[PDB]
Design a protein around this ligand. Structure first.
Ligand SMILES: Nc1ncnc2c1ncn2[C@@H]1O[C@H](COP(=O)(O)OP(=O)(O)O)[C@@H](O)[C@H]1O
Ligand SMILES: Nc1ncnc2c1ncn2[C@@H]1O[C@H](COP(=O)(O)OP(=O)(O)O)[C@@H](O)[C@H]1O
Ligand SMILES: [K+]
Ligand SMILES: [K+]
Ligand SMILES: [K+]
Ligand SMILES: [Zn+2]
Ligand SMILES: [Zn+2]
Lengths: 434, 428
């Protein structure tokens, strides 16, 4: 607190009263912009939302929630409010070809606001322009790639856009370029420490000092295990494509709850049953409204993430609220290797193969500290194929699943009737991870 | 014509040489701070007064790939990397080359890419899709920063997943696409597989590079997708994309002489070739500060196309890159380039674009086999296709001065590489 350094001091230690004043000003601006989108223009017309409906921050509960289903219904540009042809500079899309994915469109302002938030996060945990920042996140459509790339360049780091995979190349970059800061998912940070030992390098004696980990749920003990393996300080990083990507919520150097940047997001913790705010400090669904987005703002978006607001002031001096770890979700979505997957994406691929039966089972396991996804599917006794032909089909199933869910799964063709008789519900994901 | 930077793109040759000399002296003074060029300049008596004319650059020795491997990773870094270094890129072997950029270097690079896209008619109203690999490879971030700088609605699709590439083009109404020539053909084939006419999409402009390709292969891509395709040159050492680029005349690639000093040197003598002859492309960065490169031997073989261009731009044009020095192979003591084989295969419409040259040793003698896929448009029978196969062997024996074995294979039988297509497989 007495010796804490801030990227934007005036905003990061802003009084709660002036912070709420800033939220209300940006909330009115966001509602007036979103009114230009075809989607929110209909929502505001149906629910009588005018430019005078929002007079306080509590007036936001007048607006209905925006769901993933509504965004799929208005795919691809139903929620675009700005001039996409003149001001639109980027699209970020979620995985899939069997269904309508999620699309977020950004203007140059939106990219700058997003890069500033990521720079604010990196600076908060002690990362400076003198640091060598390596990003092991996937690039392309994944917001983790370009998100940290623009943020680290904005801070002034010597960036190493390593991208995903190739552990031996990740270790080569750290050794040759003297990397000090690394962005990786918790499970891959353990893999890199393992590969360091395989190549005869002490993972505790590298140039690494700071680690940024997120994208998937992990315990505080898992993080402390990563800190001991690599002799580093690891910080929890939260974000999602709908909210830009990285830079949404981030731990401070106290490593106790993730500070949510309330100047760019309005945070609500909602009871998934009633749809009403939970008692202060209880676990509920995270519902978010963008406050600095102009091309495609999102109002009261149901993340389906479950968390709580941690009570008490933080010793770092920052007044922005802190959320607890995200330990689960209120929908059927699962995360493997940091990638979000829906079970229907797997089913929509399997049904295309007449050699397969309708009964399938997706099992998630931890092997050698790395996450593995196994897809068991029964064979239809209609299959008039031998071993060589069925094995060629199995490889095609792996290929079509890899293209759809963006992770390589293990496909096992099992005998008809071998898989256990389900309760008759769509619950077909058996997670066996700790 | 419409220009991104009119004052520079149609600048008089006299003022363009004046600009080159000013930036050449600056580059030499900056590079003198690097451990590598500090030794090179001291050994060769290169001072701040050695360069008085653009011809005085021939006082400085060449920088090779071997020199960069020897000084890997930061032996040629001239600026303050800890303070001002904002990115490291790696080329696509042994230890890959490393180029370190400052914020100035990234801005100069992004500006050159936006200048290129604007030259071929791409505007902020276009939807730009980049199918280049994203990460250490300069094609990803290089075209991303350029297209955003111009103001395009960018689609960072990255490499692979053809079904997803086609979905983005259909749903986001993509108008401009960056792809390697071989992948542009793959996308057109996948369009047909998914029941979409590849000639009836929102695509208007294509940017193709990385792979050496013939003009006829480019015209084939233009007919498949009903687009205008433009040749894009670049390399990690020279930033990446935005180095050289065709104009709307599609006749030679304009080299941006405000950021690069171009030399065509004879690999034997080490002297400049007679004006317009084929030699090794030797390049010097003019607007790089963190890690400038002086007289770098690219290993690329090309020539400077003579005459001014009808587009009005005064920047010189290079011909297509016939091939790299490492791409060349030796069979029966005869030097042969893979592009010599491709230039003959493309003039047969019965053949596909996918081919593979395999080199083997049979009975202590070297043998050269050329596998080439048949196009689905071939309505010819056995006797007619065999007459074509004999004509292919004949025109090849006359071109490469060696008799090869030509085998017409089924469409899709030859392997497709993830990145650049592999045209030569040496098994000796
Ligand atoms: N730090 C984190 N801890 C737990 N879950 C996280 C964390 N960061 C992200 N997630 C999960 O990932 C989701 C965001 O996924 P996504 O939009 O695909 O972005 P990304 O490319 O980073 O995975 C969140 O809604 C949440 O469920
Ligand atoms: N337009 C082009 N036509 C032919 N060859 C090209 C072209 N662009 C690049 N190349 C080749 O690729 C080399 C650069 O490769 P590299 O630095 O690894 O970049 P990249 O990631 O795009 O492959 C050049 O030296 C040249 O041999
Ligand atoms: K730096
Ligand atoms: K995730
Ligand atoms: K645009
Ligand atoms: Zn704090
Ligand atoms: Zn021209």
């Amino acid at each position: 607190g007495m010796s804490t350094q801030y990227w934007e001091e005036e905003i990061e230690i802003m009084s709660r009263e002036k912070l709420q004043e800033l939220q209300l000003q940006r909330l009115k601006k966001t509602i007036n912009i979103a009114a230009n989108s075809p989607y929110y223009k209909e929502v505001f017309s149906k629910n009588g939302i005018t430019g005078d409906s929002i007079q306080s921050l509590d007036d936001i509960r007048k607006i209905p929630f925006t769901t993933k289903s509504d965004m799929r219904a208005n795919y691809p540009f139903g929620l675009v409010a700005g001039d996409m042809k003149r001001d639109g500079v980027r699209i970020h899309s979620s995985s899939g070809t069997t269904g309508n994915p999620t699309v977020i469109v950004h203007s140059q302002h939106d990219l700058d606001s997003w890069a500033n938030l990521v720079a604010r996060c990196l600076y908060m945990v002690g990362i400076r322009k003198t640091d060598v920042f390596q990003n092991s996140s996937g690039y392309g459509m994944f917001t983790g790639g370009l998100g940290f790339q623009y943020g680290a360049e904005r801070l002034g780091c010597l960036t190493v856009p390593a991208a995903a995979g190739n552990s031996k190349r990740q270790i080569k970059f750290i050794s040759d370029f003297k990397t000090t800061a690394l962005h990786a998912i918790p499970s891959y940070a353990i893999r890199l420490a393992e590969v360091f030992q395989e190549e005869g390098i002490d993972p505790r004696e590298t140039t690494l000092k700071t680690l940024v980990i997120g994208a998937e749920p992990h315990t505080d003990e898992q993080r402390r295990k990563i800190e001991r393996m690599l002799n580093v300080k690891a910080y929890n990083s939260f974000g999602m494509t709908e909210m830009n990507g990285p830079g949404v919520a981030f731990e401070c150097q106290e490593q106790n709850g993730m500070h949510f940047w309330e100047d760019c997001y309005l945070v609500e913790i909602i009871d998934p049953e009633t749809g009403e705010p939970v008692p202060e400090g209880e676990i509920g669904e995270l519902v978010l409204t963008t406050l600095d987005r102009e091309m495609m703002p999102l109002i009261r978006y149901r993340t389906r993430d479950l968390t709580r607001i941690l009570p008490g002031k933080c010793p770092c001096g920052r007044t922005h609220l802190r959320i607890d770890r995200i330990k689960g979700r209120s929908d059927d979505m699962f995360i493997i290797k940091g990638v979000n997957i829906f079970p229907m994406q797997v089913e929509k691929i399997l049904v295309q193969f007449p050699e397969l039966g309708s009964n399938y089972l997706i099992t998630l396991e931890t092997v050698n500290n790395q996450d593995e996804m196994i897809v068991e599917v029964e064979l239809s006794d209609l299959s008039t194929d031998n071993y060589i032909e069925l094995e060629k089909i199995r490889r095609d199933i792996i290929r079509q699943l890899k293209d759809e869910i963006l992770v390589t799964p293990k496909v096992k063709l099992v005998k008809k009737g071998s898989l256990p008789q389900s309760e008759g519900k769509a619950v077909r994901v058996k997670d066996l991870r700790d």
